[PDB]
Amino acid sequence: MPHAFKPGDLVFAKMKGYPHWPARIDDIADGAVKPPPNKYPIFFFGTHETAFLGPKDLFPYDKSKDKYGKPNKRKGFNEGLWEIQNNPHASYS
């Protein structure tokens, strides 16, 4: 049975106006800005952008990849597919 989301989990993350996007739940570094309550820091692969999202926009990667893990025209998307498949826990700093 599923647990709550935790840093390191891989997802497709949904934002208004964008396709479901390969992403991870990030850690928050010491001294770094924390997310709002009930929100997680999402690191989007490919773009390497962060946004704060709740579980309603987070689709676990293993269950979702056959649907959402397909090339997309949008900038950064296909780089993002490579990252989540090939080195999803690397530093992209």
Q: Is 54 exposed, middle or buried (0-12, 13-18, 19+ CB in 10 A)?
A: middle
Residue 78 CB: number of other CB atoms within 10 A?
15
The full length of the chain comes to 93
Residues 34 and 60: their CA atoms lie apart, in Å, by 22
- Resolved by: X-ray
Both tokens assigned to 68? 């959402």
Q: Quick one: tokens of 17? A: 């106006």
Residue 43: which of 67, 68, 76 has the closest Cα? 76
Listed by start position, the domains of the chain span 10-78
Both tokens of residue 66?
């056959």
The residues pairing with 45 across neighbouring beta strands, listed in sequence order, are none
C-alpha–C-alpha distance, residues 51 and 66, integer Å: 24
Closest CA to 78 of 32, 37, 45, 33: 45
- Which of 11, 4, 3, 6 lies closest to 88, judged by CA? 11
Q: Residue type for 2, please?
A: P
Max Cα–Cα distance, the chain, nearest Å: 38
Instruction: Map residue 11 onto helix, strand or coil.
Output: strand
Beta carbons of 39 and 52 less than 8 angstroms apart: yes
The continuous run of DSSP H or E covering 43 comes out as strand 40-44
Q: Does domain 10-78 have CATH number 2.60.40.60?
A: no
Resolution of the experimentally solved model in angstroms: 1.5
